[PDB]
Design a protein around this ligand. Structure first.
Ligand SMILES: CCCCCCCCCCCCC/C=C\[C@H](O)[C@H](N)CO
Ligand SMILES: CCCCCCCCCCCCC/C=C\[C@H](O)[C@H](N)CO
Lengths: 39, 298, 247, 238, 298, 247, 39, 39, 50, 49
């Protein structure tokens, strides 16, 4: 329920389930495989 | 005929007229007809597309406004003290619509009006000023307004047993709430209410006492009490009733009242001691029929 | 539940509000409507009906004497007979008309009016009069040569006893006002004056004085706005029997 | 091409060989009142060649101490010609105006004039509570002079007055200014003797410098009413 | 032409220009036209897709904000004591919009404005401090605000009979409620309200007293009273009226006011004793035309 | 009935709320709109109009003297003529413009401005000036060699009497502020300085001193945000006749 | 908005623009023409 | 949300994005071009 | 009018409620978003970092 | 009356047209200059600025 003209007045948008743990956990130039020896 | 008029009439262009046998500006008031001379045949007009609306002046909008119909104050204390054996924290009003001249004169512009009544009850409260008049705020009291039709028993005390109102409609409303509001239907026994009755309300031919009393204007009584028992201090309750008519239908327009009213039961008149609104002189006097009173001094 | 909040003006009682409200007598059956003559749908139907003007609103004139103007045989040509102040808010000849009694319930007005005059002399009396309307801006014309320069109609007494002088809507603004300031641009309407065009002529045995009745009305282009309380009535005390209704 | 300009109205014409441009106020042109907007129902009179023509007022002398000049734009003509006579005999008036301002000098003179037309210039008074009197504002064809042109005698500012329709007369470039004014009013028509729609103001923002040449440098104002019409004929009042 | 501008103009790329007969940066202020020199022809610009909106600065949003238009206090006691025979628990206000400079200067940026008025009434209450000023809380009083058009009778007392308001619109609102709110329509007799009137309001040629008074700005009176009868103690009622315009249309922009206002009836000016906002010096003084007052000291 | 509950902020009056509210005059018919020239839809239409700058805002300069800058024949080349502080919130030459009077009703701004200068000397006076805009970061340039390193335009007096110096939008952030701190990163805009490019040259009989008028405006990319109360006006007492309205 | 059972509870009906000025201004047996001489 | 009969009772109409900077910035009889010499 | 009644918990302020509320700056235009590296959508992205 | 305002510039000549404004179709070269059939009017020059 939003009866205000300005869209910023709306309720919270608690719905964005996308994730990308890889910018922080694996931020390397060459992608690391699984079980393969790192370096 | 009957025409739908959302706006007023336009003006059309007009031209020089010099015809024999055509006299638009000549009339005959004896026929009882108002002159039909239009501006376009009185003078040489231009065209004007006129978009002035007519909605504000509809009868429904002319009369459909809340106006004061009753106002009455009463004491909220313990009246049992003394020689009075009855609590008496209440009052009774016989419903009429001729007590306050503003609404009355607006209604008496017509002979018959059919309307539903939107009733609004506005309570106010004060604290009586006497001796120990140490202010302590206004209590939030609940009031009961009971409609009592003709022939129903009427309460004689605040603690009477007529206040159960098994059949009589009642409203319980508090001081701090919005005003109480309810609609009374069109409740006449005839097709319309009569603002004027040129007759008598009794079959018996009494010498006096029954002229102008309409048999159908017997709407009954409004009784209002305080539900709470008396407090140790005395308060003054003022009840104002506002009537708004709606779904209005009006017939037979009448000359407006010019003399001040004197009673709620008759059309008796006396006027003022001098003009304006005097029995010999409704309009104020000017020096002579050749005198502008408000004349531009060029 | 429905999440809500309260706006300013909640709980107010405004005497011009328009809402439904609880029916106090449920399943009540109102009396069926019969046909009654003279139904009024709009108040502009009423102001279009003519009514007499107290043109003779002077001291000495009592009652019906005020509704009629004496016209009598002149001994001076071009003579001024009477004038009518074209105002509705202030006390004047128009203030007696049904037009002015309905209009004074409103603040703004627009549209053309009309004044109808009626000759009530004998059949053997003849005459010619000129009735002139002067748009505002200056003083009232007191001579016929100055008065005939505006809107006028020359009335010749005959078998038709009524003349109509239309007051055309000549205003700068779309609406005027019923202001207490008669000398204001938004309120002043002008003047109406009557002069002898030729004379009143009567035979030897006929009466040398006669009367005119004057009437005024609105026309079909007339409109009213901004309803107010009319200054034509007021209370000072409770009426007789008003407080007797509580006992 | 846009430096020369000839204006022709009725039996009067004006040429200029060093005009800047023509200023049409708010991108508008004068026109007669349409039936869609009219309110007075009587047939208007529309004298065209006898009223819609240039009227040249008295000239004012531009000195080094000059503060500026203004003309209330109907009021300046109410006593002039057939326009004035129609104004006197009729209750209601309507027109535009075409205002042409003339001030010529040499190539050694210098100075700038702001020719600005102010709609509804309600005049203020300095250092007093009482309002301006009838004489202070109804100056007629003579016009008035500014007391404090820097606040437009109005407590506003001269600097922002360029929001109004205006032209300049820069002596090094141009010697005339022309502004065409439509009808400005809330109402369809008005009583010409008690309300002024426009004020034509001439303000020397850059002061005149003669530099040894001719000293008497006059400013001349010519105004032509545009699309005049009048309603409510009666006797003449002045 | 007329363009719809949800955002501001983009910037396009620009390149070296060395052309004969093309002088974009050269203008002529005498024509009365503002310079048309764009940034892309003044300097070598990059492209910029610009998404800055223009909605906040719309005239409807610039003026459509509630601002104080009236504020007035009055005493709520029994004034009948003494030589005063009139209750006088009320006040009357002649409606104007030139009393408070904040809203006034914002309106006088245009010559004509057409708008509907959203009116909000904010009551406050205090208890008068004198002798027996023992606090007991603020009563929940009901107030009546009645609009009185030109020519209507005006109340002279708290208990006057003009307060029935059969035709005059009234609002009854309590102290503890939300502020009262109602919309007044565009109620001018002309097509728009005039913020400035260069003329006189009377046909008569009086020497002084009628310059700048607009005949159409006669909106009438606002009368506000206390419905309750007097309490044994005295209270002070403060009424603040907020005006919000809506559906706004504005014509003919004007130079903003720089001198402080002195009256509500004229544009008279005096300024301050020294810059800024002085009749000879609107902007404050710097030492010379070569002096930065706020200069970075590198 | 409908089960409801009240949210926080119920019964508040917020001066920026946008709701319908009860019509006080029901069935009122407003006056029909006529065409009036000069309709304004947006305030950014107004700030795009040029207005004079009080460049000569010094003691001794009174009234119109402040709106004009004297340029006179130099006896020293490369001479500094004047400078303009590029600020709108503080007291400066821009504070007189319509741009700055509308902008000061808002807190944030963005977009390019423009300053137009007008030569009002005699026809026989020639000259060349350079008008330089310096992006912020350091002190104002006082020598021409340092000043010409930024954005500049060389103005040659001729048949076209006006030059335009565009102040390009060169800001780190998308918007700036009308902060009281002129030395702030979010508020400082830079400097504008004028230097003699060659000289003013006049004949023997011509005046050796001339004036410039300066104007400023916004361009089509200019925008304003976060409307506030302008510091350009304020009350201290009730105005004359303000309390007379209650009697 | 009317959620009451009885139709008389409804809002006002301020919508009847029909007019007949002729029952009052010209209530005569023979209709009067325009410009023709009355009687 | 407007449940009142009179249309003037409605909310504000803050939606008219049309502009015409040309009645004020270039109110001249002959349209000025770009780069062309004014007069 | 609409017949209504008020439930328990009306007029409460609960710090975890989720409703619209009145815009204080009407027609305000926020600064357009630019790309900034390192956007976090969930806090479980962070606890996965050693 | 009928007039033309002459501004000195690059064009050195102005033209004031005397329009034919006569009651009759023709006029006369009469010895009576004050006659209805002969008098034509006046031409006057004034300093504009
Ligand atoms: C639940 C009902 C309790 C409250 C009852 C309130 C009754 C008050 C009614 C006052 C006005 C009634 C008017 C009724 C009829 C007409 O107006 C009159 N006959 C006048 O013609
Ligand atoms: C039910 C109505 C009772 C309350 C009436 C409140 C009236 C208060 C109105 C104050 C402001 C009215 C403004 C009206 C018109 C314009 O703003 C002015 N003419 C200014 O141009």
């Amino acid at each position: 329920i939003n009866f205000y003209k300005d869209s910023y007045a709306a309720s919270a948008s608690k719905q964005d389930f996308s994730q990308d743990p890889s910018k922080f956990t694996e931020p390397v130039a060459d992608a690391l495989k699984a079980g393969a020896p790192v370096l | 005929i009957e025409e739908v008029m959302k706006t007023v009439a336009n003006t059309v262009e007009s031209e020089i007229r010099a015809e024999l046998g055509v006299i638009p500006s000549l009339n005959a008031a004896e026929t009882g007809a108002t002159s039909n001379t239009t501006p376009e045949e009185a003078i040489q007009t231009r065209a004007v597309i006129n978009q002035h609306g007519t909605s504000e002046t509809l009868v429904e909008n002319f009369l459909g406004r809340a106006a004061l119909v009753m106002m009455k104050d009463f004491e909220y204390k313990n009246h049992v003290t003394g020689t009075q054996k009855v609590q008496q924290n209440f009052f009774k009003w016989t419903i009429n619509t001729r007590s306050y001249v503003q609404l009355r004169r607006k209604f008496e512009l017509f002979t018959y009006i059919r309307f539903d009544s939107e009733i609004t009850i506005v309570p106010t409260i004060r604290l009586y000023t006497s001796t120990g008049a140490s202010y302590s705020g206004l209590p939030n009291l609940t009031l009961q307004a009971m409609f009592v039709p003709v022939g129903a028993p009427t309460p004689k005390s605040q603690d009477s047993y007529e206040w159960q109102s098994a059949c009589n409609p009642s409203v319980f409303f508090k001081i701090d709430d919005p005003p109480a509001r309810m609609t009374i239907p069109f409740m006449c026994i005839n097709s319309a209410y009569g603002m004027f009755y040129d007759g008598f309300a009794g079959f018996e031919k009494t010498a006096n006492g029954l002229y102008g009393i309409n048999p159908a204007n017997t709407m009954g009584n409004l009784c209002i009490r305080v539900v709470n028992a008396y407090q140790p201090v005395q308060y003054t309750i003022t009840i104002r009733i506002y009537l708004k008519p709606k779904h209005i239908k009006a017939w037979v327009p009448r000359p407006p009242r010019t003399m001040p009213y004197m009673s709620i039961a008759n059309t008796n008149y006396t006027g003022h001691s001098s003009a304006p609104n005097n029995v010999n002189a409704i309009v104020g006097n000017r020096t002579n029929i050749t005198t502008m009173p408000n004349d531009i001094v060029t | 539940g429905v999440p809500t909040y309260l706006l300013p003006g909640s709980s107010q009682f405004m005497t011009t509000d328009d809402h439904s409200s609880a029916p106090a007598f449920p399943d009540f059956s109102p009396t069926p409507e019969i046909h009654i003559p003279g139904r009024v749908h709009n108040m502009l139907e009423l102001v279009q009906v003519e009514s007499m003007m107290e043109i003779n609103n002077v001291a000495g004139s009592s009652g019906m004497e005020r509704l009629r103007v004496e016209i009598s045989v002149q001994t001076d040509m071009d003579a001024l007979l009477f004038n009518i102040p074209l105002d509705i808010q202030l006390d004047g000849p128009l203030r007696s008309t049904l037009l002015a009694n309905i209009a004074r319930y409103y603040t703004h007005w627009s549209g053309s009016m009309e004044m109808t005059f009626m000759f009530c002399g004998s059949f053997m009396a003849t005459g010619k009069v000129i009735l002139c309307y002067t748009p505002p801006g200056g003083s009232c014309p007191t001579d016929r040569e100055s008065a005939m320069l505006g809107t006028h109609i020359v009335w010749d007494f005959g078998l038709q006893s009524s003349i109509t002088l239309v007051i055309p809507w000549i205003s700068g603004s779309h609406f005027r006002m019923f202001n207490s300031d008669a000398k204001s641009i938004n309120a002043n309407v002008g003047y109406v004056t009557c002069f002898m065009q030729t004379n009143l002529i009567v035979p030897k045995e006929a009466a040398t004085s006669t009367y005119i009745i004057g009437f005024a009305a609105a026309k079909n282009d007339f409109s009213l706005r901004l309803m107010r309380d009319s200054p034509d009535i007021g209370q000072s005390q409770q009426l007789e029997g008003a407080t007797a209704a509580f006992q | 091409s846009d430096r020369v300009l000839q204006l022709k109205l009725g039996n009067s014409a004006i040429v200029t060989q060093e005009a800047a441009n023509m200023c049409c106020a708010y991108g508008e042109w004068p026109s007669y009142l349409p039936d869609n907007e009219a309110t007075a129902i009587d047939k208007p009179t529309q004298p065209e060649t006898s009223t819609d023509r240039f009227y040249t007022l008295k000239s004012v002398k531009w000195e080094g101490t000059s503060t500026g000049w203004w003309w209330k734009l109907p009021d300046a003509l109410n006593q002039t010609g057939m326009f004035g006579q129609n104004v006197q005999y009729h209750y209601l008036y309507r027109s535009g105006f075409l205002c042409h301002v003339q001030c010529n000098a040499t190539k050694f003179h210098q100075g700038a004039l702001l020719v600005v037309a102010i709609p509804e210039h309600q005049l203020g008074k300095y250092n007093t509570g009482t309002s301006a009197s009838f004489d202070d504002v109804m100056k007629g064809k003579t016009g008035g002079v500014f007391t404090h042109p820097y606040v437009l005698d109005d407590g506003t500012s001269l600097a922002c007055s360029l929001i109004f329709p205006h032209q300049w007369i820069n002596l090094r470039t141009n010697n005339s200014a022309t502004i065409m004014l439509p009808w400005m009013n809330c109402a369809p028509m008005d009583f010409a003797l008690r309300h002024n729609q426009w004020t034509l103001a001439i303000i020397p923002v850059v002061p005149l410098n003669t530099s040894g040449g001719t000293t008497m440098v006059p400013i001349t104002v010519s105004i032509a009413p545009m699309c005049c019409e009048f309603n409510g004929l009666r006797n003449a009042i002045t």
